[PDB]
Amino acid sequence: PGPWMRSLKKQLASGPRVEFFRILFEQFYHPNFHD
Amino acid sequence: TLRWRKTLYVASLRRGFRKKSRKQRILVMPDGENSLITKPTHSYTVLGKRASRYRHQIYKDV
Amino acid sequence: NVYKGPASIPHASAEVFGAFFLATNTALLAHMFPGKLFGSELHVRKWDPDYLASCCNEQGMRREALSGKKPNLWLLGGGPRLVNDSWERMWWNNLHWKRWKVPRTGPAFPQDMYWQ
Amino acid sequence: LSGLLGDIGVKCTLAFAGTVAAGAAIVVPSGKQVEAASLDIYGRPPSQLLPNERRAAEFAAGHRRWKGFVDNSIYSWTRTLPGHDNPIVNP
Amino acid sequence: ARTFERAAFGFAKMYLFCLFMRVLLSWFPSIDWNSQPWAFLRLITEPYLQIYRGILPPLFGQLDFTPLFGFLILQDVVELMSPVYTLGHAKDTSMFWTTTD
Amino acid sequence: FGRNEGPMTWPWKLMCAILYMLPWVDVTEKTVYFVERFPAFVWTEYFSEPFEHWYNIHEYAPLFIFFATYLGIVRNKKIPHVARYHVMMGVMLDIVAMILIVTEENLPTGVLWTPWSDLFYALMFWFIFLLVIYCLFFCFLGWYCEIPLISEGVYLQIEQAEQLGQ
Numbered sequence: 144p145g146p147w148m149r150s151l152k153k154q155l156a157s158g159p160r161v162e163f164f165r166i167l168f169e170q171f172y173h174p175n176f177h178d
Numbered sequence: 179t180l181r182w183r184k185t186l187y188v189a190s191l192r193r194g195f196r197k198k199s200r201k202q203r204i205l206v207m208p209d210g211e212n213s214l215i216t217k218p219t220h221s222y223t224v225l226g227k228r229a230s231r232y233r234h235q236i237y238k239d240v
Numbered sequence: 241n242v243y244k245g246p247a248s249i250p251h252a253s254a255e256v257f258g259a260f261f262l263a264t265n266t267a268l269l270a271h272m273f274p275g276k277l278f279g280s281e282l283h284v285r286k287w288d289p290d291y292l293a294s295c296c297n298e299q300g301m302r303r304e305a306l307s308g309k310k311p312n313l314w315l316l317g318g319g320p321r322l323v324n325d326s327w328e329r330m331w332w333n334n335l336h337w338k339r340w341k342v343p344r345t346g347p348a349f350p351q352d353m354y355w356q
Numbered sequence: 357l358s359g360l361l362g363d364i365g366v367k368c369t370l371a372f373a374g375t376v377a378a379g380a381a382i383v384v385p386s387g388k389q390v391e392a393a394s395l396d397i398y399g400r401p402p403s404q405l406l407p408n409e410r411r412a413a414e415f416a417a418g419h420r421r422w423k424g425f426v427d428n429s430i431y432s433w434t435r436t437l438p439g440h441d442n443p444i445v446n447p
Numbered sequence: 448a449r450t451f452e453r454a455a456f457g458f459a460k461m462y463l464f465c466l467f468m469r470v471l472l473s474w475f476p477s478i479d480w481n482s483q484p485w486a487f488l489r490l491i492t493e494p495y496l497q498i499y500r501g502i503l504p505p506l507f508g509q510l511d512f513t514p515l516f517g518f519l520i521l522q523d524v525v526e527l528m529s530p531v532y533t534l535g536h537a538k539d540t541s542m543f544w545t546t547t548d
Numbered sequence: 549f550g551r552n553e554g555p556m557t558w559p560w561k562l563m564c565a566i567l568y569m570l571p572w573v574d575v576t577e578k579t580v581y582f583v584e585r586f587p588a589f590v591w592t593e594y595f596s597e598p599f600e601h602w603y604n605i606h607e608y609a610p611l612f613i614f615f616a617t618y619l620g621i622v623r624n625k626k627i628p629h630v631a632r633y634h635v636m637m638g639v640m641l642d643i644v645a646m647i648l649i650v651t652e653e654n655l656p657t658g659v660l661w662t663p664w665s666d667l668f669y670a671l672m673f674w675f676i677f678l679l680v681i682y683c684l685f686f687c688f689l690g691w692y693c694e695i696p697l698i699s700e701g702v703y704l705q706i707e708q709a710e711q712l713g714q
């Protein structure tokens with residue numbers, strides 16, 4: 144069921160601050176941006 | 179123009195308005211006067227709407 | 241070993257389905273790239289119907305004129321309709337035939353290649 | 357052959373043909389175009405009429421015959437019984 | 448440690464692919480499991496499906512759905528351990544402040 | 549034997565066509581990526597809308613249809629064999645479409661953000677479309693259409709559905 148799995152998943156330096164610019168550099172590389 | 183973007187798509191109010199009232203922010207740990215008007219500081223956070231739009235534009239460019 | 245149905249009802253093999261699949265894919269690929277099929281392309285027809293009609297009319301009119309009679313022109317689609325209202329209705333058949341010139345000849349898919 | 361009659365398609369084709377035959381029997385006019393339709397709608401003999409006018413006269417005669425048949429044969433029979441309370445849509 | 452989660456997720460996806468291949472191969476009974484690829488696949492996949500064989504009997508005793516159930520359960524389990532923000536279009540938080548996110 | 553082996557009639561053909569219309573509903577979302585080229589198939593975008601509405605009225609409709617067909621139709625040995633064969637073929641085509649959807653859901657982001665995905669999407673429609681058309685050409689005709697890697701399994705499954713718990 145949906146709600147139980149959702150609750151369990153929600154039960155488990157932030158994303159937008161650093162990870163947004165880290166993943167883009169790691170995966171989608173371009174010299175105009177990352178050189 | 180604005181008439182074109184309004185024509186394209188505005189929003190989907192499934193849960194109602196998605197934009198809410200603004201919340202002023204104040205510095206906690208330390209101005210040219212002009213104290214006549216208190217400027218809005220709700221956007222100084224990184225988790226705000228303007229930063230999301232900027233990240234969206236950067237992602238589109240990249 | 242398995243039943244596979246009665247023998248009276250005809251069965252289709254798998255080779256025919258494989259041929260159909262490969263033929264469809266190859267037709268699409270050949271249509272996409274005009275100049276890569278061994279340096280040639282794929283044509284649906286040999287001669288355009290209008291070209292054949294024009295040649296036949298030319299030859300017939302030449303033969304009739306040489307024989308000593310006023311030549312006649314054969315129309316694709318049909319002759320006129322005896323009406324007294326409008327000119328389009330009188331010659332509706334030939335106009336209907338001629339109005340399909342572009343769809344009859346040209347291909348629906350783009351002629352050149354994009355994105356490659 | 358009853359085998360042909362066994363198939364559904366043959367039965368449907370025969371029913372369609374019979375309906376067409378009955379319609380042609382009951383609506384096709386004969387001699388009433390010049391007598392009634394042509395003179396009434398154009399005031400000219402049918403021969404002098406244009407080909408698209410003769411068809412109109414024939415259609416008018418056929419429609420008159422159809423209305424006459426539907427009034428004098430079906431509607432009299434089905435209206436000899438008066439209005440039987442005339443059920444109407446309740447909602 | 449990002450490397451730990453990365454390796455764990457990769458291993459989980461590979462095991463999911465192996466289970467899906469087992470489910471696909473369950474359709475063909477003519478294959479021999481003594482051949483090297485099929486033997487290796489069944490050697491890898493034996494215990495996890497063996498558990499569910501004991502746990503769940505066939506519905507009518509004639510049709511077997513154990514590999515499908517194992518695949519579905521493992522798919523849900525690995526879905527539980529997905530990254531919070533998968534990027535793509537997710538990390539952009541859609542457009543502006545939104546009802547969805 | 550007591551199993552019926554006569555020809556299929558028109559109502560069974562109509563039922564089988566309606567059943568075959570299911571994978572088309574499942575893979576109708578990716579029709580544009582193919583229709584953008586060769587516009588002559590543009591009608592294929594607008595044909596499945598009522599079937600999309602009817603097959604998606606309830607979330608568990610496909611499972612109900614599968615259980616009603618496998619047990620109610622395929623198991624019965626008094627229904628002509630061709631009708632059961634076509635029903636099982638349609639079910640297997642739906643299974644193949646589900647497999648295609650599942651393998652679509654796990655595409656890497658590198659392939660996702662490249663034009664290759666578009667090609668993939670087109671194929672996800674086109675191949676499936678072909679299959680359906682082929683089956684339909686042998687559904688309105690009361691014949692057996694044989695497809696590699698599927699027909700033999702269908703033949704085995706037909707007789708496994710029979711003598712079920714007996």
Ligand SMILES: CCCCCCCCCCCCCCCCCC(=O)OC[C@H](CO[C@@H]1O[C@H](CO)[C@H](O)[C@H](O)[C@H]1O)OC(=O)CCCCCCCCCCCCCCCCC
Nearest residue numbers: 588589590591592593594595596597598599600601681684
């Ligand atoms: C004066 C008479 C002029 C009438 C001309 C009639 C043209 C009709 C010819 C028959 C065409 C068959 C299509 C009928 C299918 C019904 C499906 C439906 O309505 O979908 C209607 C949909 C359109 O769907 C509509 O689309 C709209 C778009 O804005 C909206 O989305 C609407 O919501 C949606 O309903 O059209 C199709 O899906 C067409 C499918 C065609 C499939 C190809 C048929 C392959 C077989 C052809 C063989 C020849 C068939 C016989 C032809 C000769 C007939 C005399």
Ligand SMILES: CCCCCCCCCCCC
Nearest residue numbers: 372373374376377380381384
């Ligand atoms: C094949 C269906 C039609 C055949 C019968 C034609 C009816 C009109 C005949 C008129 C004769 C004067």
Ligand SMILES: CCCCCCCCCCCC
Nearest residue numbers: 471472475476477478479697
């Ligand atoms: C998805 C591709 C599947 C290929 C493996 C199955 C091949 C079965 C061959 C059986 C020969 C007897």
Ligand SMILES: CCCCCCCCCCCC
Nearest residue numbers: 648651652655656658659668
């Ligand atoms: C049906 C097959 C779809 C494509 C599977 C392979 C994915 C391509 C990249 C593999 C190496 C990263």
Ligand SMILES: CCCCCCCCCCCC
Nearest residue numbers: 659664665667668671672675
């Ligand atoms: C190298 C990138 C992947 C190349 C193949 C992707 C498209 C495969 C189409 C298969 C459709 C079933």
